[PDB]
């Protein structure tokens, strides 16, 4: 709560990351964070913060911090932001308009790309309605694009909702895998348990 560094290593340096449709959340509480080291780290392609200045993060205290992590491709990193539309923002990971936190992303091509293609990472392709902020949808029910029922089999206007990424080493930068960590800062009328030093 005061004599322990926040376990950010278990999030950023995690061996395995989740698919964006099943994004993982970890609660960061009762620890001391060092945000300046992350902000000035030369290993991050994206470090955009909303509702809070990243330079004065070591001077702020919060009751709780939550770290959401997943993998998308480069040209989709722009969607992990408030007020965005697209396959990821609409169907996979949605930030609220009043989001207070930081979005961190880096190229993970050397880790998440296989010789014949990494097909373990998935994303949701269809949905009846857009996700609400911080909603997670892990259902694998056949998407009904027409008025006729699908009966659990794919066909005309009946498609499986999840699609796999390509991720091959020779893909363009915009198509290469990127690992994303979304830190959100929670501030309740309670003792603050996560401060910066």
């Amino acid at each position, epitope marked *: 709560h005061h004599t322990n560094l926040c376990p950010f290593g278990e999030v950023f340096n995690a061996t395995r990351f989740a698919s964006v449709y099943a994004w993982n959340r970890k609660r960061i509480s009762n620890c001391v964070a060092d945000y300046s080291v992350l902000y000035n780290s030369a290993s991050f392609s994206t470090f955009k913060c909303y509702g809070v200045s990243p330079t004065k993060l070591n001077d702020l205290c919060f009751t709780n911090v939550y770290a959401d992590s997943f993998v998308i491709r480069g040209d989709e990193v722009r969607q992990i932001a408030p007020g965005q539309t697209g396959k990821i923002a609409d169907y996979n990971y949605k930030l609220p308009d009043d989001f207070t936190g930081c979005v961190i992303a880096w190229n993970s091509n050397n880790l998440d790309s296989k010789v014949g293609g990494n097909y373990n990472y998935l994303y949701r*392709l*269809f*949905r*009846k*309605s857009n996700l609400k902020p911080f909603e997670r949808d892990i259902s694998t029910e056949i998407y009904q*694009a*027409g*008025s*006729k029922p699908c009966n659990g089999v794919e*066909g*005309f*206007n009946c*498609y*499986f909702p999840l*699609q796999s990424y390509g991720f091959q080493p020779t893909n363009g930068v915009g198509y290469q895998p990127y690992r994303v960590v979304v830190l959100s800062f929670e501030l309740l009328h309670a003792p603050a348990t996560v401060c910066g030093k």
Partner: antibody, heavy 123, light 109 residues
Framework: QVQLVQSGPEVKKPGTSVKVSCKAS????????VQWVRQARGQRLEWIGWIVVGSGNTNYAQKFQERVTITRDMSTTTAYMELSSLRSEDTAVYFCAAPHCNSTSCYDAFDIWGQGTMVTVSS | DIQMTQSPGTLSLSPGEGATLSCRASQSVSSSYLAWYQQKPGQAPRLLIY???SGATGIPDRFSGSGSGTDFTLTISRLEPEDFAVYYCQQYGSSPYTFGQGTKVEIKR
């Protein structure tokens, strides 16, 4: 203005390849699907294959599995049919069709049809 | 693969008569995936009926469809001059989405 506009006429020598385009407009392309159908002069409609726009998954008829690949580019809202190893018997008009859709729902049949593309194969 | 057969090959009727076209499948197809198309010479197919018994948008109500399983029927109650063309049926429930050989509706003179 829900539309499907195909490429112009094609005249290819035997053994070459042809790639017919099929650009969509007026509806939401990303949740629909495009089938390809050819028709010789005075003959019946013959199904070649189809592609789901969102996933790119394809099915082909047994006759065309060897020489046909159906693709699509969502950035240019166009679907393509590429037929390799052309021969005289491939000389026909080629149609693309799709159901119109909004962001979530789709029509329950191929109700949109292109104008067709005449492909000629001879020496 | 599902074989689609249509009958008759040609239908010779006077303007004003009723038309009844047959489409048969070699095995059961889902009625919600059977469509009828109209094609005039030099033109692209136009969707008339879908789901065996549902008219497409903009289609006059004189076009009627029925069927389930293997036997399907397209019915034109009052043949209009613009209705004389070739009619195809297509099943699109099981891939490949096969067509029938077509039925020509000509004017009996």
């Amino acid at each position: 203005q829900v539309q499907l506009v195909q490429s112009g006429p094609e005249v290819k020598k035997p053994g070459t390849s042809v790639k017919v385009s099929c650009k969509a407009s007026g509806f939401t392309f990303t949740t629909s699907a495009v089938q390809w159908v050819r028709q010789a002069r005075g003959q019946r409609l013959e199904w070649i294959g189809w592609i789901v726009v969102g996933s790119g998954n394809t099915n082909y008829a047994q006759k065309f599995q060897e020489r046909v690949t159906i693709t699509r580019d969502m950035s240019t809202t166009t679907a393509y049919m590429e037929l390799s190893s052309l021969r005289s018997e491939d000389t026909a008009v080629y149609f693309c069709a799709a159901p119109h859709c909004n962001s979530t729902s789709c029509y329950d049949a191929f109700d949109i049809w292109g104008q067709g593309t005449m492909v000629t194969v001879s020496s | 693969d599902i074989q689609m057969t249509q009958s008759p090959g040609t239908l010779s009727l006077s303007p004003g008569e009723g038309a009844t076209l047959s489409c048969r499948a070699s095995q059961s197809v889902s009625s919600s995936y059977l469509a009828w198309y109209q094609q005039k010479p030099g033109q692209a197919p136009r969707l008339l009926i879908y789901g065996a018994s549902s008219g497409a948008t903009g289609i006059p109500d004189r076009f009627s469809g029925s069927g389930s399983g293997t036997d399907f029927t397209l019915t034109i109650s009052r043949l209009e001059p613009e209705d004389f063309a070739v009619y195809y049926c297509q099943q699109y429930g099981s891939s490949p989405y096969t067509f029938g050989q077509g039925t020509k509706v000509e004017i009996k003179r």
